[PDB]
Amino acid sequence: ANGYANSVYFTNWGIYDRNFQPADLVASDVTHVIYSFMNLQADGTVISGDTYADYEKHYADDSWNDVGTNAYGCVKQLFKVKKANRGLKVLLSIGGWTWSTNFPSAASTDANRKNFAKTAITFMKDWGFDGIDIDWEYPADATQASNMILLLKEVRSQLDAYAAQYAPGYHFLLTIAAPAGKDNYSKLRLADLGQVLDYINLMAYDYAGSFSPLTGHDANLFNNPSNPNATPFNTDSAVKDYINGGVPANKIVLGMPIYGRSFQNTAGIGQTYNGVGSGSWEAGIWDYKALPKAGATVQYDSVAKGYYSYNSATKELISFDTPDMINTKVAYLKSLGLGGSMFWEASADKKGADSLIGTSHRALGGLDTTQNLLSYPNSKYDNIKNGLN
Ligand SMILES: [Zn+2]
Ligand SMILES: [Zn+2]
Ligand SMILES: [Zn+2]
Ligand SMILES: [Zn+2]
Ligand SMILES: [Zn+2]
Ligand SMILES: [Zn+2]
Ligand SMILES: [Zn+2]
């Protein structure tokens, strides 16, 4: 709004094995935290996928003897973050890869869309959040694409009505996560999305993995015509298609991965491979903070603009973003007038100089300082209603 976005996904399941709590966020680097994910029913009902993580878990200073009805979990922890970081906005994210199967039904009728908006906004206002992010992966045809716009317009309308009563003058944010593959984005109502939304977070990653016939760059900027098997996708073609399709450049936030995708038993990038192997927490996927691994050296495809660790002894290649990659992507996004950087996801980042999110903050320079909201007079949680005072 008044500067670049530097946003990050915070997953509610990251509080378990990953042990990444909201207090662990380096909040000074972040303009938006995208709190992920709420689930969705076929009738449009938005629901918590984890009530413990969301609002029940007691942290060390969460009393067992508070009066009233009170929110704990990540909700209270994030409200603390918001108080201490007035330029940091928290968005309620709905859907994702696993929980998008009910979006078509949820967007399909006026009643369902109204129920979606009301239930989503109820969580947002109860939890003390600044907006809503919709991650429908992915609208499959024209009917769904049109219905997505109808859904977003309903949420925008209801947000504005909510603010007029309970946060006058505050602009609640409405965003999406958006596909970088043309097979998906060619179905979207791009011009409508450009008009109705505050931000489009481009998922400029997951270009290559276990689903690909050869090793590929996961999040490269450009095609490599001298080694095109290494670049099954590229970000630049997607960015230009979004802008030319009617999404204003300043609303596009360039997603970047804080993880690598591994390829086993291979000679290099663009080449044959056997499996993806193990991961940090799930097969084929490695936290950036574990990379590069011991005995691996980072190489760079300067045409594609993509790095990868290589270990000459084990034949493991891992495609991942480095601090230098982030500097290059920030130079790129600034050159096209984009709105900033987005990251999936917070728990996997390094701390200090090698933080991808911190690298992005420094390369962007002037971050969005638009003030968050701390007034929730209609929250059902007394502690949120009282601003934790
Ligand atoms: Zn476990
Ligand atoms: Zn309790
Ligand atoms: Zn996703
Ligand atoms: Zn507004
Ligand atoms: Zn707006
Ligand atoms: Zn995951
Ligand atoms: Zn700064």
Numbering used by the authors: 35 to 423
How does the study describe this entry?
The chitinase Chit42 from T. harzianum (orthologous to Ech42) plays an important role in the fungus anti-phytopathogens activity. Chitinase Chit42 from Trichoderma harzianum hydrolyses chitin oligomers with a minimal of three N-acetyl-d-glucosamine (GlcNAc) units. Chitinases from GH18 are retaining enzymes, which means that the β-anomeric configuration found in the substrate is retained in the product, showing an unusual substrate-assisted catalytic mechanism where the acid protonating the glycosidic bond (to be hydrolysed) is a conserved glutamate residue (included in the DXXDXDE sequence), and the nucleophile is the oxygen of the N-acetyl group (of GlcNAc) on the subsite − 1 sugar. All chitinases described in yeast and fungi are included in the family GH18.
We have modeled a chitooligosaccharide within the active site channel by structural superimposition of the reported complex of this substrate with the Serratia marcescens ChiA-D313A mutant onto the coordinates of Chit42 here presented. Although ChiA and Chit42 sequences are only 26% similar, the corresponding residues located at the active site are rather conserved. Therefore, the distorted conformation of the substrate at the cleavage point observed for ChiA fits well within the Chit42 active site groove. First of all, the substrate is tightly recognized at subsites − 4 to + 2 by a net of hydrogen links to several Chit42 residues. Therefore, there are at least 6 substrate-binding subsites in this protein. According to our complex model, Glu316 is hydrogen linked to O3 of the sugar at subsite − 2, but seems also able to link to a free amine group by a slight switch of its side-chain, therefore compensating the loss of the hydrogen bond to Trp378 and contributing to stabilized a deacetylated sugar at this subsite − 2. According to our model, Arg52 is also involved in allocating the sugar at this subsite; therefore, its flexible chain provides additional plasticity to the sugar type occupying this binding subsite. A last interesting feature is the fact that the side-chain of Trp131, making subsite + 1, presents rather weak electron density in our solved free enzyme crystal, revealing a marked disorder.
